[PDB]
Amino acid sequence: EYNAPSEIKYIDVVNTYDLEEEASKVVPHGGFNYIAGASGDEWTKRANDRAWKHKLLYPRLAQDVEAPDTSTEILGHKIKAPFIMAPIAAHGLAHTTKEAGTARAVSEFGTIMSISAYSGATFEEISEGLNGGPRWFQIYMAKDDQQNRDILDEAKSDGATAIILTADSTVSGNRDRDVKNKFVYPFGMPIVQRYLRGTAEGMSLNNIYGASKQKISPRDIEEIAAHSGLPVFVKGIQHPEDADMAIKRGASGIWVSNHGARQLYEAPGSFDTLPAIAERVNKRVPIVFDSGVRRGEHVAKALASGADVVALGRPVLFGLALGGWQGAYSVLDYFQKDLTRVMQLTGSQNVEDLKGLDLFDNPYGYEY
Amino acid sequence: EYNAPSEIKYIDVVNTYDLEEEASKVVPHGGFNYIAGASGDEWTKRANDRAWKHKLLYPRLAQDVEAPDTSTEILGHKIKAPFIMAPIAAHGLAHTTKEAGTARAVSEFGTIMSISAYSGATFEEISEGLNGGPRWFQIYMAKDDQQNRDILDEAKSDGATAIILTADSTNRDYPFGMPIVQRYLRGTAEGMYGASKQKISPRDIEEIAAHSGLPVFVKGIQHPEDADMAIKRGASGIWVSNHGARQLYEAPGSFDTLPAIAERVNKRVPIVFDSGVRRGEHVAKALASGADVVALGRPVLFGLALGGWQGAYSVLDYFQKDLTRVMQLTGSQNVEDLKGLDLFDNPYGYEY
Numbered sequence: 001e002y003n004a005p006s007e008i009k010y011i012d013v014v015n016t017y018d019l020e021e022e023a024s025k026v027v028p029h030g031g032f033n034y035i036a037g038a039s040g041d042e043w044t045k046r047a048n049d050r051a052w053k054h055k056l057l058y059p060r061l062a063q064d065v066e067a068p069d070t071s072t073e074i075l076g077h078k079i080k081a082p083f084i085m086a087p088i089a090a091h092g093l094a095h096t097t098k099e100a101g102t103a104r105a106v107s108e109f110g111t112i113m114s115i116s117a118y119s120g121a122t123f124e125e126i127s128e129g130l131n132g133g134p135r136w137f138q139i140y141m142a143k144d145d146q147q148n149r150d151i152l153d154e155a156k157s158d159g160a161t162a163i164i165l166t167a168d169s170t171v172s173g174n175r176d177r178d179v180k181n182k183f184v185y186p187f188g189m190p191i192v193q194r195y196l197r198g199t200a201e202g203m204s205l206n207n208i209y210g211a212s213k214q215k216i217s218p219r220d221i222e223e224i225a226a227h228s229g230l231p232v233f234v235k236g237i238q239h240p241e242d243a244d245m246a247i248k249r250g251a252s253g254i255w256v257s258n259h260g261a262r263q264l265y266e267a268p269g270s271f272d273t274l275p276a277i278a279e280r281v282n283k284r285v286p287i288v289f290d291s292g293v294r295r296g297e298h299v300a301k302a303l304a305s306g307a308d309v310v311a312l313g314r315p316v317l318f319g320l321a322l323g324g325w326q327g328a329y330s331v332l333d334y335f336q337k338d339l340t341r342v343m344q345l346t347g348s349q350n351v352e353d354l355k356g357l358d359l360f361d362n363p364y365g366y367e368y
Numbered sequence: 369e370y371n372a373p374s375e376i377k378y379i380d381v382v383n384t385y386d387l388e389e390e391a392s393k394v395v396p397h398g399g400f401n402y403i404a405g406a407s408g409d410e411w412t413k414r415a416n417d418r419a420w421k422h423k424l425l426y427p428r429l430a431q432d433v434e435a436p437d438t439s440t441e442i443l444g445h446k447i448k449a450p451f452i453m454a455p456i457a458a459h460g461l462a463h464t465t466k467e468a469g470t471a472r473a474v475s476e477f478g479t480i481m482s483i484s485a486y487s488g489a490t491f492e493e494i495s496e497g498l499n500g501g502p503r504w505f506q507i508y509m510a511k512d513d514q515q516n517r518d519i520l521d522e523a524k525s526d527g528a529t530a531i532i533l534t535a536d537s538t539n540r541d542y543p544f545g546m547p548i549v550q551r552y553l554r555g556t557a558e559g560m561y562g563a564s565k566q567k568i569s570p571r572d573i574e575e576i577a578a579h580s581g582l583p584v585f586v587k588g589i590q591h592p593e594d595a596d597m598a599i600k601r602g603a604s605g606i607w608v609s610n611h612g613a614r615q616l617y618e619a620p621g622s623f624d625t626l627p628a629i630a631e632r633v634n635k636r637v638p639i640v641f642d643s644g645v646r647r648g649e650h651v652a653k654a655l656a657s658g659a660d661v662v663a664l665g666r667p668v669l670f671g672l673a674l675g676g677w678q679g680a681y682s683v684l685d686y687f688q689k690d691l692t693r694v695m696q697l698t699g700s701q702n703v704e705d706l707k708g709l710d711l712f713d714n715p716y717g718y719e720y
């Protein structure tokens with residue numbers, strides 16, 4: 001069986017990169033490699049990281065007297081800082097309290113929880129941690145329309161206030177850890193098993209992964225947007241034409257992502273794709289950005305480049321490994337404090353001022 | 369005295385350029401040159417026009433089955449099409465029904481009327497033409513703090529839903545009064561131009577934004593840093609304009625300045641764009657480049673000269689119909705689709 005860490009404690013987060021190596025000491029090797037790894041030789045995961053050096057922050061004089069305020073609003077919900085939790089499968093690979101632990105951290109901090117369809121936790125377990133906090137539900141597009149009806153009803157029943165339609169799947173990702181390590185999940189998918197039980201699709205992990213279309217179309221977006229009764233974010237957008245087609249099909253948001261470099265290999269770093277998408281979106285729908293956010297400076301650069309919020313992923317799971325909900329809360333607190341420092345140095349009093357930053361174009365890239 | 373046109377009639381508007389030469393035949397020479405003219409030898413007015421050829425529209429396949437809809441909303445106000453009326457002084461130079469005529473056209477069509485600081489009509493005359501329709505009030509920054517508090521109180525009591533703070537006052541190689549400014553410039557000789565600051569500062573924007581009780585647009589922005597400073601000072605909107613090339617000479621065409629401003633604004637406040645809009649394609653290009661709406665100026669006044677409120681209405685109708693055709697050819701079903709257009713960069717400019 002699977003020996004996840006179970007300790008609950010606050011952690012002194014000085015930077016999020018060191019959390020990866022610290023988590024590698026407490027997370028079983030197979031689970032750790034599932035979380036940390038990425039496609040191919042991880043060049044596009046490194047590109048996610050290095051892309052932040054392509055656009056650099058300028059320190060700027062202040063024009064306002066007040067203390068910085070990190071709060072913002074998305075879909076009418078006020079959140080403590082311009083970051084949400086990304087949808088991540090199987091939080092139990094990092095900690096025994098699993099998605100309930102992360103939900104407690106996110107709800108206590110004051111932002112939005114994204115629930116993966118591949119949660120290892122029941123919604124009842126997650127609800128305990130959420131304690132009324134806002135939540136969005138991430139889904140894959142099922143080949144069988146009934147399964148889409150089923151998960152949209154599950155999301156409405158669970159008080160979701162948005163759907164995140166992930167554009168890519170059947171556990172994709174040429175060379176993270178399943179072709180190499182030969183590691184398979186130690187637990188189930190109770191959210192989808194609720195509705196797949198007694199169908200062929202529920203019989204195995206392969207059948208669950210295989211129940212999804214491998215890539216969505218604009219027609220798929222239109223069907224989910226028409227029947228969800230909720231705003232739909234399309235997640236995995238890296239090209240501006242796709243953003244335009246998704247909005248025309250009825251998307252209520254664009255979630256710019258390469259899923260933490262877990263799918264297509266030898267693709268751009270996600271941040272390099274953001275400005276072209278934001279210019280084409282041109283204010284029509286909110287933008288969520290993710291894939292590689294590690295520092296407060298990254299949150300600021302994403303806002304300056306057209307994101308309304310960013311989503312956080314691996315660093316929150318590494319925090320959860322190291323301290324359960326308190327460890328995940330420490331990571332959210334780190335980002336909020338670091339963002340406040342960046343606001344002070346850029347002369348920004350609020351999140352709107354961050355959206356107005358001028359960035360320095362660095363044509364030399366990472367080695368400068 | 370000044371013999372302005374008085375006929376009220378609809379007009380067949382095939383293009384707005386021909387309205388200028390048609391209006392030149394009915395408007396007294398002095399009044400016409402006041403309206404049509406611009407700074408220096410009019411190079412920057414021509415730049416305003418030629419800038420539209422810098423970014424070209426693509427015809428595109430449709431992705432929706434519905435007929436085009438031009439409706440939009442700004443500051444919660446639903447309007448028929450993504451254009452509003454620009455604040456223009458002294459409509460009585462163009463037609464005897466003056467700002468009341470323009471207000472009737474704008475209210476009958478279904479958009480927002482901007483009332484100039486230097487209106488020749490009383491608020492009561494304009495109010496009758498508006499018949500309840502939405503209006504924004506344009507002001508200059510007074511040197512006297514109490515004059516600013518008084519015009520802001522008057523605007524809000526007259527049902528204004530936004531203030532337009534024009535950043536510049538008056539350039540090139542007035543036979544009736546101003547009842548609205550003279551309605552608080554009696555007692556001391558400011559109504560006898562020297563009453564207003566020639567250029568505003570961020571501190572001025574902050575003073576107006578803090579005392580208006582209404583969203584303030586700052587009008588005349590052409591540089592992105594000024595947009596950022598204005599928003600930080602409490603502006604609720606940016607109005608990208610060179611006032612129809614009537615102020616600074618040997619400056620860029622207004623449309624060429626819009627993308628840099630829109631990228632810096634980055635959705636923080638709505639953008640109004642003006643200076644040179646003459647065709648539906650221009651409305652589409654401004655929206656694709658970050659404007660929420662455009663403002664129309666000279667073409668509506670030429671329509672007023674030719675037909676009073678019905679002539680001005682004819683021009684608004686032309687822009688709406690022309691925009692609908694552009695939407696069909698760009699594969700756009702609605703105004704949000706226009707905001708998503710890709711434009712072709714033309715590095716050759718006008719002569720191609």
Ligand SMILES: Cc1cc2nc3c(=O)[nH]c(=O)nc-3n(C[C@H](O)[C@H](O)[C@H](O)COP(=O)(O)O)c2cc1C
Binds near residue numbers: 262
């Ligand atoms: C372990 C793991 C599992 C993930 N599972 C999902 C998933 O179930 N649904 C999904 O939409 N994205 C999934 N993602 C992608 C995340 O939502 C997010 O895009 C990514 O973590 C961002 O990259 P970063 O964590 O490196 O910053 C997963 C990512 C990780 C690391």
Ligand SMILES: Cc1cc2nc3c(=O)[nH]c(=O)nc-3n(C[C@H](O)[C@H](O)[C@H](O)COP(=O)(O)O)c2cc1C
Binds near residue numbers: 484485486612
């Ligand atoms: C005759 C005339 C008078 C104007 N008076 C004012 C004014 O009182 N207040 C103001 O903010 N702008 C004023 N403007 C500028 C207009 O608001 C607007 O920016 C300009 O008409 C747009 O250029 P266009 O008409 O060539 O497209 C005036 C413009 C014209 C042509």
